């Protein structure tokens, strides 16, 4: 049994982390007070859920998490929320004034004076691990803290924990739920200084989560609560293998091996289905072939793109529910004869498949409905580069006029780090095209 | 259409299917980046105060 | 706990500020004695942003009243809410400024500035974490213009990394006290260019034309103009005074509205504006057609003569947020020739559930528009029409100023016009 | 008030569409780099599809189906036909073709020689054509001509028995314009053209390519009888239909039109699961120009498919207006007797 330490940075990272650990508890049977009736080893044990929860002599199950925000308003929701008893105060770190959506401010100005503190709190969670696997980092692209402070924390974690792996859950900026104009800058700044420090990154485009809420859940104007309860469902499915008995994705190392053959291309696309409204009278339950066939629809991708005009490098299918291998293979055959799935000639055309028999848990009173089976597909497609193209294009439009650039230089950053960062994306985009197009 | 490495436990099972075969900055350097920008903030604020003194 | 420090200076500064505290104090359930009597916890959530909590559950505004004559401030202390302001926060002289920028900035004002900063420092020292400052004042007078900018220059010296925000009233010959108002305004504008992050331009002529033409006021008065500024000030500050994550911090707002350090002069707007057909409910489409209409803008500038660098909208009231987005996206998509295409998504919309007093719903417009150059063009034209003949210069040279400093203020603002011009293309 | 942008100044077709849109008073043109657009008339090469469908509140539409180059490229078309089971290698309406890469760079060189040596042995007609033009009956010259270049080429069977119009004894081809809207309905323009050759067909001299190539630019450049029989070497369906009835005692519908409507279906239906925008975040629609050949047995063969074709001068008005009815207005309705023929199919 090896431990996994989760790190939530910024508002988006913190709220999403609040919805995952809420979901983790309902899944593993943990109550708000940290008590777990099904755990027969009191204050000890090396079970599959112990990779995410430590135990106290009193029987409390404490998440292996650390929350970090440069302003206390968002983390204060955790200290008084439903699951306040789960964490102790050390795990929650808050500042006094934020980064004002300025990467330079979160990385340099404010980050420098708080970096040593975070590491020390993280070192305390590491001092409980008998064999720490790595870290799961949740943050946003647009926020000054989520972008600026994350890249700095990543640089430092590669120094204090060299051999340890580091995965990202990043939030792609979408104008429909953002009031910041400089989020392109931040996104492209953080992705540059973070690239060589992350082993595998799952981008969730708010635009995708937004339309999935409006279309499937019939929410006219979704709130962050709606978005986070869905995002944590995907996260739960991706982390399940680490928290349950199983043989696929049993530790963070298996994610890079099974999903990232080329290092810089460590952004797998995620697809999820089904997402059914809870307010529905009563839905006809989908089969294995129907939910699998849905994983190849742009409508339920975490990043809107067209995989048909890309080339897959790897592919995983995580099933949760009443599913058996006989049904999985059946659907795959039928899909290959219909769909357009072009692999790269230096990778096998295969699918690693995991199955967990416990169906997806739903938050009481949430928006999602209880389904008997559901799947999450992690596919490394060159089609995700479309996201980088859009983002890069917006960057070019502003930087051409140096718009807003003074706010970054005013916090000590050099104007050169802009182009240097943008040239790295230009290289990232070329690596995708060299691997996909003919 | 082959199914290899079938692993089964009580909570589930995982396997593989093959359709077709194929064909850092040290601690010293980060403290310098941080202290370098902090020096350009100090020089920009000094020039601001110098302007205000004039 | 993100506290703001309010400062009002001069005749215009204090009367407008006074009404401002009258307007928001009503929205937060604060009575003229400081006691709270609202009915919604949303009223107190962000109350410590503009108010200090004294003993007995009393809420004392975080405001500093400044003037070089006692007249105007005596009226505030005897006005409606005058009793609510901290007694020590009244800092005033007796000389007066004689509507002279030089007196407010170099001679009279200089003698009183140190003691006003003594009070600002006393308010900041109590703040758990200070966002920044906001100053209400006029630019055509002598105190709020001459001494006001002196305070900003000195505040930025003692707090160089805090946000400096101002509500500036621009003079107009149609609403003119003295003929030296262009001199005073041209001299302040250079200070605001250098030492302020955000400045809400408010042209008195626009306020006049709005009262005469739209509101149907036969003979408008300063009080009528101040009502609008109150409603407008109450509007732009909604982001900061209630639970809204859209434009929370002054620095965040500045970071999203100011693409360039010097172009930070905003055009504010308000809707509805109805004459006493006043009970009619106003639909979301109507709110948006007026909010962008020039006749609802208070800079007296035609936005269709320039381009929008950034735009912030705030909608207050129980309405369809889905319908808000739809109409906002409609305005952009039907007039995308007036929004610069080199700033993606330069139009942001915030929603607030608590409406202003006496309105089922309203909207507030905040626009960083290159058309604001039309304002600085009128001032620079009136300035030159006199400075070429050295007319009325003795009032200033007699206070220690040189014709050189006037020539520089001139050239410094003609440069500001040119700057707004290269970005309009 | 709908809005659109233009990114292809050289397009003679959509240039007219842009003129008709503004003549409606309900469409507004924007700069070619403004992303707040309802409709895009995109560039031919490297159209930025990845940036479409990401503007909130806007339903965006584009005039190029992403991935249609599979059908509008010489080597791509051949590869598509021989690999797609919907078309099979035994396809009867497409000339036997092979993809040949130059030796200075898969490749079907040896496969072509086998079928070539089989024809020279059986006394059959062994005349092939290379393109990406040379016509020769010797395998040595066709291959040697490709090596002298540096791009991919295609060698397919040359129809030695083409149908010849009389008087004249001249070759010709047929151009059919097909429009596909966002719902993937296949509309065929009721009006086609025949870009005819003004020179008599001669099968004993492939050196002079004036009587073998029916292109409008080659006939108007290397032909000495241009415009003799019909205006601009373009005979339309009415006249060509009357001719078929007078000489052969049959109609254009029965003899050729049925095969054309069948080819257009089998090609477009084949790639529908690959380019469809039925569940995409944006919508697509494209105009196509199919080039057919007809032999002396009244059998229709498919030559190539143009993804950015032009139109006959006489038919610019009627067709462009039709593109606005079924493709644009059906998505952005404004405030007949269709000039198309819907080719129903199973989606
Ligand atoms: N999906 C999702 N996105 C969020 C959430 N909160 C913020 N965002 C997105 O994050 C982006 C802004 O980043 P923030 O997380 O608010 O910034 P921050 O980390 O708090 O850093 P500061 O700039 O200092 O405030 C916007 O594009 C939002 O759409 C959330 O709870 N869920
Ligand atoms: N296998 C074949 N049999 C008979 N004729 C052929 C042929 N292949 C090509 N041609 C002749 O070549 C001409 C078409 O050439 P092709 O279309 O390959 O070049 P191109 O694409 O530059 C012209 P366009 O795109 O305008 O149709 C036709 O007029 C046809 O007569
Ligand atoms: N909107 C508004 N403008 C005013 C008011 N009082 C004065 N002004 C304007 O301010 C300018 C005079 O400035 P004033 O406040 O008298 O200067 P002071 O000496 O600093 O107080 C003139 O252009 C007036 O039009 C007022 O109550 N409301
Ligand atoms: C002297 N003077 C400018 C005024 O009394 C005045 C005030 C307000 C107004 F709207 C119009 C006028 Br006029
Ligand atoms: Ca245990
Ligand atoms: Ca590493
Ligand atoms: Ca004195
Ligand atoms: Mg924040
Ligand atoms: Mg006065
Ligand atoms: Mg061609």
DSSP C67-99: ESSSHHHHHHHHSSSGGGS-GGGEEE-SS--TT
DSSP H or E segment with residue C383: helix C373-387
| Single residue among C225, C259, C293 that ends a domain in this structure | C259
Residues D50, A385: C-beta atoms closer than 8 Å: yes
Is D214 within 8 Å of D292 (Cβ atoms)? no
Distance A190 CA to ligand 1 centre (A): 14
What Å resolution does this PDB entry report?
2.8
Phi, then psi, of C336 in degrees rounded to 5: -70, 0
Report helix, strand or coil for A312: strand
Q: Which of A3, A183, A254, A411 is catalytic?
A: A254
Query: Angle at Cα D179 formed by Cα D175 and Cα D183, nearest 5°?
Result: 155
- How far apart, in Å, are the Cα atoms of D211 and each of C191, D151, D164, D168, D199? 82, 26, 11, 11, 5
- Say whether both C312 and C268 belong to one domain: yes
Q: How many residues does chain C have?
A: 425
Q: What residues does A301 pair with on adjacent strands?
A: A271
Query: Angle at Cα C85 formed by Cα C82 and Cα C87, nearest 5°?
Result: 105
- Say whether both C117 and C166 belong to one domain: yes
Residues C344, A98: C-beta atoms closer than 8 Å: no
Helices and strands, counts by H and E, chain D: 10, 16
- C-beta contacts of C26-33 below 8 A and 24+ residues apart: C26/C357, C27/C234, C27/C241, C27/C354, C27/C356, C27/C357, C28/C59, C28/C241, C30/C59, C30/C84, C32/C80, C32/C81, C32/C83, C32/C84, C33/C58, C33/C83, C33/C84
> Which residues lie below 8 Å from residue C170, measured CB to CB, with a gap of 6+?
C139, C140, C185, C201, C202, C203, C204, C299, C375, C379
Q: Where are the beta strands (DSSP E) in C372-416?
A: none
- Say whether both C358 and C401 belong to one domain: no
**Which DSSP category does A105 fall into?**
I
Chain A residue numbers touching B46 (CB-CB < 8 A): none
Residues 33-52 of B with CB under 8 A from A: 34, 36-41, 44
- Look at residues A106, D31, D210 and name the one whose alpha carbon lies nearest to residue C341: D31
Q: What share of chain D is helix, strand, coil (3-state, %, to 5)?
A: 30, 20, 45
CA A319 to chain centre: 18
Chain A residue numbers touching B12 (CB-CB < 8 A): 244-246, 354-357
Give yes or no for C160 touching B (CB within 8 A): yes
DSSP H or E segment with residue C52: strand C51-53
Hunting for tokens 């946000």 — which residue is that? C163
- Look at residues D36, D72, D64 and name the one whose alpha carbon lies nearest to residue D48: D64
Q: How far apart are CA A150 and CA A114, in angstroms?
A: 12
For residue D33, how many other CB atoms are within 10 A of its CB?
11
CA D231 to chain centre: 22
Question: Ligand 3 within 6 A of C170 CB?
Answer: no
Question: Ligand 3 within 6 A of C141 CB?
Answer: yes
Cα torsion C389, C395, C398, C401: sign: negative
Is C408 within 8 Å of C342 (Cβ atoms)? no
Q: How far apart are CA D229 and CA D248, in angstroms?
A: 19
Return the CA Rg of chain D.
21
Q: How far apart are CA D113 and CA C113, in angstroms?
A: 98
What is the maximum alpha-carbon separation in chain B?
81
Token duo for residue D298: 């009244």
Is B17 within 8 Å of A332 (Cβ atoms)? yes
Strands D300-306 and D128-131: unpaired
- Look at residues A108, A85, A87, A111 and name the one whose alpha carbon lies nearest to residue A9: A111
To the nearest 10°, the Cα dihedral for A47, A48, A54, A58?
A: -40
Pocket-testing residue among A146, A172, A270, ligand 1, by greatest number of atoms within 8 A of Cβ:
A146
Counting ligands in written order, which one lies closest to the CA of residue A166?
6
Return the CA Rg of chain C.
21
Q: Is position C143 annotated in a ligand binding site? A: yes
- Look at residues A387, A383, A386, A357 and name the one whose alpha carbon lies nearest to residue A372: A357
Total domains in the fold of chain C = 3
> Which residues lie below 8 Å from residue D110, measured CB to CB, with a gap of 6+?
none
Residues D50, A390: C-beta atoms closer than 8 Å: yes
Read off the CATH number of the domain in which D63 is found.
Answer: 3.40.50.11480
Burial (Cβ within 10 Å: 0-12, 13-18, ≥19) of residue A14: buried
HSE, side-chain direction, 13 A CA sphere, residue B12:
25
Q: Which of C155, C157, C195 should we substitute to test contact with B (largest number of B Cβ atoms within 10 Å)?
A: C157
Q: Is position C69 annotated in a ligand binding site? A: yes
Give yes or no for A77 touching B (CB within 8 A): no
> Which residues lie below 8 Å from residue A365, measured CB to CB, with a gap of 6+?
none
- Say whether both C311 and C418 belong to one domain: no
Annotated binding-site residues of A for Mg(2+) read 71
- How far apart, in Å, are the Cα atoms of D31 and each of A331, D7, D15, D153? 47, 9, 15, 38
- How far apart, in Å, are the Cα atoms of C104 and each of C46, C309, D144, D204, D315? 35, 34, 92, 104, 78
- Which range of residues forms the domain containing residue C402? 372-425
Q: DSSP labels for A3-55?
A: -EEEEEEHHHHHHHHHHHHHHHHHHHT--TTS--TT--STT----GGGGTEEE
Tell the residue nearest (CA) to atom 13 of ligand 4.
C175
Q: Report the side by side order of strands in the sheet with A269-273.
A: A269-273, A373-381, A312-321, A349-356, B12-20, B2-9
Token duo for residue A104: 């330079």
Atom nearest to C174 CA in ligand 4: 13
For chain A, what are the domain ranges? 1-268, 269-383, 384-438
- Look at residues D43, D42, D4, D37 and name the one whose alpha carbon lies nearest to residue D20: D4
Which of D50, D53, D279 lies nearest to residue A297, judging by beta carbons? D279
Interruptions in chain B after residues (C–N over 2.5 Å): 23
Q: Find the closest chain C residue to D27 by CA distance.
A: C334
Is C297 within 8 Å of C206 (Cβ atoms)? yes
Residues D3, C336: C-beta atoms closer than 8 Å: yes
Question: Alpha helices of chain D — where are they, by DSSP H?
Answer: 12-22, 69-72, 74-83, 109-121, 139-147, 216-222, 237-247, 252, 258-275, 316-323
Interruptions in chain A after residues (C–N over 2.5 Å): none
Q: Is the peptide bond before B31 cis (omega within 30 degrees of 0)?
A: no
Hunting for tokens 């405030």 — which residue is that? D335
Is A111 within 8 Å of A154 (Cβ atoms)? no
Query: Angle at Cα C45 formed by Cα C43 and Cα C46, nearest 5°?
Result: 95
- C-beta contacts of C287-291 below 8 A and 24+ residues apart: C287/C315, C287/C327, C287/C361, C287/C362, C287/C363, C288/C327, C288/C328, C288/C330, C288/C331, C288/C363, C290/C363, C291/C363, C291/C364, C291/C365
Which of B19, B21, B37 lies nearest to residue A412, judging by beta carbons? B37
- Say whether both C231 and C300 belong to one domain: no
Cα torsion C206, C208, C213, C217: sign: positive
Is D127 within 8 Å of D136 (Cβ atoms)? yes
Cα torsion C295, C300, C306, C307: sign: negative
Q: How far apart are CA C126 and CA C118, in angstroms?
A: 13
- Say whether both C188 and C274 belong to one domain: no
> Which residues lie below 8 Å from residue C131, measured CB to CB, with a gap of 6+?
A97, C2, C3, C4, C49, C162, C163, C240, C249, C250, C251
Phi, then psi, of A69 in degrees rounded to 5: -145, 140
Token duo for residue C342: 């080199």
- Which range of residues forms the domain containing residue D45? 2-68
- Look at residues C195, B34, C122, C161 and name the one whose alpha carbon lies nearest to residue A97: C161
To the nearest 10°, the Cα dihedral for D41, D47, D48, D54?
A: 30
Pick left, alpha or beta for residue A323 (phi over 0 → left; psi -120 to 50 → alpha; otherwise beta).
beta
Q: What residues does C199 pair with on adjacent strands?
A: C166, C265
Q: How far apart are CA A135 and CA A198, in angstroms?
A: 10
- Say whether both C399 and C310 belong to one domain: no
Q: How far apart are CA D243 and CA D45, in angstroms?
A: 40
Q: How far apart are CA A190 and CA A146, in angstroms?
A: 9
- How far apart, in Å, are the Cα atoms of A228 and each of A8, A12, C39? 13, 9, 31
- How far apart, in Å, are the Cα atoms of D307 and each of C4, D70, D287? 62, 10, 7
DSSP H or E segment with residue A427: helix A416-436
- Say whether both C220 and C72 belong to one domain: yes
Report helix, strand or coil for C320: coil
Residues A325, B7: C-beta atoms closer than 8 Å: no
- Say whether both C109 and C234 belong to one domain: yes
Question: Ligand 2 within 6 A of D95 CB?
Answer: yes
Is C117 within 8 Å of C89 (Cβ atoms)? no
Give how far B11 is from chain A: nearest CA, Å: 6
- Say whether both C191 and C236 belong to one domain: yes
Question: Ligand 3 within 6 A of C370 CB?
Answer: no
Residues with CB under 5 A from ligand 9 (ion): C 11
Chain C residue numbers touching D1 (CB-CB < 8 A): 334
> Which residues lie below 8 Å from residue D206, measured CB to CB, with a gap of 6+?
D127, D135, D136, D137, D212
Chains C and D touch (3+ CB pairs under 8 A): yes
Q: Is the peptide bond before D288 cis (omega within 30 degrees of 0)?
A: no
- How far apart, in Å, are the Cα atoms of A209 and each of A231, A365, C112, C287? 7, 19, 58, 30
Strands C347-352 and C308-316: parallel
Question: Ligand 3 within 6 A of C10 CB?
Answer: yes
**Please, what's the b/e burial string for A183-205 (b: 16 or more CB within 10 A of its CB; e: otherwise)?**
bbbbbbbbbbbbbebbbbbbbbb
For residue D149, how many other CB atoms are within 10 A of its CB?
12
Give how far C197 is from chain A: nearest CA, Å: 11
Give yes or no for A412 touching B (CB within 8 A): yes
> Which residues lie below 8 Å from residue D173, measured CB to CB, with a gap of 6+?
D194, D195, D214, D291, D292, D293, D303
Catalytic (active site) residue A113: no
Distance D217 CA to ligand 10 centre (A): 12
Phi, then psi, of A425 in degrees rounded to 5: -65, -45
Q: Find the closest chain C residue to A403 by CA distance.
A: C259
Distance C12 CA to ligand 3 centre (A): 4
- Say whether both C80 and C207 belong to one domain: yes
Give how far B48 is from chain C: nearest CA, Å: 9
Residues B45, C160: C-beta atoms closer than 8 Å: yes
Tell the residue nearest (CA) to atom 19 of ligand 1.
A10
Q: Find the closest chain B residue to A322 by CA distance.
A: B12
Q: Which of C158, C160, C197, C405 should we substitute to test contact with B (largest number of B Cβ atoms within 10 Å)?
A: C160
Q: What residues does B15 pair with on adjacent strands?
A: A353
For residue A415, how many other CB atoms are within 10 A of its CB?
13
Which of D3, D34, D56 lies nearest to residue C341, judging by beta carbons? D34
Give how far C341 is from chain D: nearest CA, Å: 6
> Which residues lie below 8 Å from residue A44, measured CB to CB, with a gap of 6+?
A55
Q: How far apart are CA D142 and CA D113, in angstroms?
A: 11
> Which residues lie below 8 Å from residue A256, measured CB to CB, with a gap of 6+?
A165, A199, A200, A266
Distance C11 CA to ligand 9 centre (A): 5
Phi, then psi, of C269 in degrees rounded to 5: -150, 155
Give how far C247 is from chain D: nearest CA, Å: 20
- Say whether both C21 and C36 belong to one domain: yes
Token duo for residue D144: 């040697």
Counting ligands in written order, which one lies closest to the CA of residue D154?
2
> Which residues lie below 8 Å from residue B50, measured CB to CB, with a gap of 6+?
none
């Amino acid at each position: 049994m090896r431990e996994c330490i989760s790190i939530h940075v910024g508002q988006a990272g913190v709220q999403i982390g609040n919805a995952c650990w809420e979901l983790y508890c309902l899944e593993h049977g943990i109550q708000p007070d940290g008590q777990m009736p099904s755990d027969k080893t009191i204050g000890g044990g090396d079970d599959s859920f112990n990779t995410f929860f430590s135990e106290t002599g009193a029987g409390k199950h404490v998440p292996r998490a650390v929350f970090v925000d440069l302003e206390p308003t968002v983390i204060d929701e955790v200290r008084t929320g439903t699951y306040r008893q789960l964490f102790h105060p050390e795990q929650l770190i808050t500042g006094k004034e934020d980064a004002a959506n300025n990467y330079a401010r979160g990385h340099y100005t404010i980050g420098k004076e708080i970096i040593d503190l975070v590491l020390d709190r993280i070192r305390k969670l590491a001092d409980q691990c008998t064999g720490l696997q790595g870290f799961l980092v949740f943050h946003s692209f647009g926020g000054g803290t989520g972008s600026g402070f994350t890249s700095l924390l990543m640089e430092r974690l590669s120094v204090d924990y060299g051999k340890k792996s580091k995965l990202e859950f990043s939030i792609y900026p979408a104008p429909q739920v953002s009031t910041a104009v400089v989020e392109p800058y931040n996104s492209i700044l953080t992705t540059h200084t973070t690239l060589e420090h992350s082993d595998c990154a799952f981008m969730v485009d708010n635009e995708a989560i937004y339309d999935i809420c409006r279309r499937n859940l019939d929410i006219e104007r979704p709130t962050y609560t709606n978005l986070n309860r869905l995002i944590s469902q995907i996260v739960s499915s991706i982390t399940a293998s680490l928290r349950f008995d199983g043989a696929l994705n049993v530790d963070l190392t298996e994610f890079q091996t099974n999903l990232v053959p080329y290092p810089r291309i460590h952004f797998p696309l995620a697809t999820y289905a089904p997402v059914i409204s809870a307010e529905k009278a009563y839905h006809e339950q989908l089969s294995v072939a129907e939910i699998t066939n849905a994983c190849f629809e742009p409508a339920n991708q975490m990043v809107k793109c067209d995989p048909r005009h890309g080339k897959y490098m790897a592919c995983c299918l995580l099933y949760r529910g009443d599913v058996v291998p006989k049904d999985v293979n059946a659907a795959i055959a039928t899909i290959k004869t219909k769909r357009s799935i072009q692999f790269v000639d230096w990778c096998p055309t295969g699918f690693k498949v995991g199955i967990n028999y416990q169906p997806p848990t739903v938050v009481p009173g949430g928006d999602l409905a209880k389904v008997q089976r559901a799947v999450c597909m992690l596919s490394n497609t060159t089609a995700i580069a479309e996201a980088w193209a859009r983002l890069d294009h917006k960057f070019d439009l502003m930087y051409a006029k140096r718009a807003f650039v003074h706010w970054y230089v005013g916090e000590g950053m050099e104007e050169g780090e802009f182009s240097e960062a943008r040239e790295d994306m230009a290289a990232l985009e070329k690596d995708y095209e060299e691997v996909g197009v003919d | 259409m082959e199914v290899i490495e079938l692993n089964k436990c009580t909570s589930g099972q995982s396997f593989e299917v093959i359709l077709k075969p194929p064909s850092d900055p040290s601690l010293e350097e980060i403290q310098k980046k941080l202290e370098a920008a902090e020096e350009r903030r100090k020089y920009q604020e000094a020039e601001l105060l110098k302007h205000l003194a004039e | 706990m993100r506290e703001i420090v309010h400062i009002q200076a001069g005749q215009c500064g204090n009367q407008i500020g006074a009404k401002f505290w009258e307007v928001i104090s009503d929205e937060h359930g604060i009575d003229p004695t400081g006691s709270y009597h609202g009915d919604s916890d949303l009223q107190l959530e962000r109350i410590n942003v503009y108010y200090n909590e004294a003993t007995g559950n009393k809420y004392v505004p975080r405001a500093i009243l400044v003037d070089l004559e006692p007249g105007t401030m005596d009226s505030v202390r005897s006005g409606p809410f005058g009793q609510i302001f901290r007694p020590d926060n009244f800092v005033f002289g007796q000389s007066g400024a004689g509507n002279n920028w030089a007196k407010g900035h170099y001679t009279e004002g200089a003698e009183l500035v140190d003691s006003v900063l003594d009070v600002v420092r006393k308010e900041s020292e109590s703040c758990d974490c200070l966002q920044g400052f906001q100053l209400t004042h006029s630019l055509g007078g002598g105190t709020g213009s001459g001494m006001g900018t002196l305070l900003i220059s000195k505040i930025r010296e003692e707090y160089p990394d805090r946000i400096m925000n101002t509500f500036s009233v621009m003079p107009s010959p149609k609403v003119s006290d003295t003929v030296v108002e262009p001199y005073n305004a041209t001299l302040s504008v250079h200070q605001l260019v250098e030492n302020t992050d955000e400045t809400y331009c408010i042209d008195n002529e626009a306020l006049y034309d709005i009262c005469f033409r739209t509101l149907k006021l036969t003979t408008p008065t300063y009080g009528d103009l101040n009502h609008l500024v109150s409603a407008t000030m109450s509007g732009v500050t909604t982001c900061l005074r209630f639970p809204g994550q859209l434009n929370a911090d002054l620095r965040k707002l500045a970071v999203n509205m100011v693409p360039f350090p010097r172009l930070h002069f905003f055009m504010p707007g308000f809707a509805p504006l109805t004459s006493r057909q006043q009970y009619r409910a106003l639909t979301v489409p109507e709110l948006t057609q007026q909010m962008f209409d020039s006749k609802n803008m208070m800079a007296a500038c035609d936005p269709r003569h320039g381009r929008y660098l950034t735009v912030a909208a705030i909608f207050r009231g129980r309405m369809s947020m889905k319908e808000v987005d739809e109409q906002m996206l409609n305005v952009q998509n039907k007039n995308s020739s007036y929004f610069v295409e080199w700033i993606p998504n330069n139009v942001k919309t915030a929603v607030c559930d608590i409406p202003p007093r006496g309105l089922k719903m309203s909207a507030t417009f905040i626009g960083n528009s290159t058309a604001i150059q039309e304002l600085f063009k009128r001032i620079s034209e009136q300035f030159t029409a006199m400075f070429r003949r050295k007319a009325f210069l003795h009032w200033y040279t007699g206070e220690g100023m040189d014709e050189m400093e006037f020539t520089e203020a001139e050239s410094n603002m003609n440069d500001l016009v040119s700057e707004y011009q290269q970005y309009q293309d | 008030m709908y809005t659109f942008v233009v990114r292809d100044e050289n397009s003679s077709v959509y240039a007219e569409v842009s003129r008709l849109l503004l003549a409606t008073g309900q469409w507004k043109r924007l700069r070619k780099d403004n992303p707040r657009f309802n409709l895009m008339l995109g560039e031919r090469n490297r159209l930025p599809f990845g940036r479409l469908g990401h503007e909130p509140g806007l339903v965006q539409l584009v005039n190029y189906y992403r991935g249609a180059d599979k059908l509008c490229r010489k080597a791509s078309l051949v590869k598509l036909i021989k690999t797609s089971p919907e078309l099979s290698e035994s396809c009867t309406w497409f000339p036997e073709s092979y993809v040949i890469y130059p030796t200075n760079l898969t490749d079907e060189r040896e496969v072509f020689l086998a079928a070539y040596n089989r024809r020279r042995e059986g006394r059959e007609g062994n005349v092939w054509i290379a393109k990406s033009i040379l016509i020769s009956s010797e395998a040595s010259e066709l291959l040697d001509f490709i090596d002298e270049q540096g791009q991919v080429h295609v060698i397919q069977k040359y129809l030695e028995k083409p149908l010849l119009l009389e008087p004249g004894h001249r070759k010709f081809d047929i151009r059919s314009w097909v429009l596909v809207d966002h719902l993937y309905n296949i509309y065929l323009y009721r009006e086609g053209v025949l870009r005819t050759s003004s020179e008599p067909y001669n099968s004993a001299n492939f050196q002079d390519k004036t009587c073998h190539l029916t292109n409008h630019c080659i006939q108007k450049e290397y032909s000495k009888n241009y415009g003799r029989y019909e205006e601009g070497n373009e005979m339309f369906f009415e006249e060509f239909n009357q001719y078929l009835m007078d000489a052969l005692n049959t109609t254009l519908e029965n003899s050729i039109l049925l095969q054309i409507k069948h080819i257009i279906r089998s090609c477009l239906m084949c790639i529908e699961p690959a380019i469809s925008t039925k569940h995409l975040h944006y919508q697509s629609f494209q105009l196509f120009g199919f080039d057919f050949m007809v032999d002396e047995e009244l059998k229709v063969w498919l030559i190539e498919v143009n993804g950015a074709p032009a139109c006959a001068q006489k038919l610019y008005a009627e067709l462009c207006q039709g593109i606005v009815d079924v493709a644009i207005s059906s998505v952005f309705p404004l405030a007949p007797t269709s000039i198309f023929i819907k080719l129903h199919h199973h989606h």
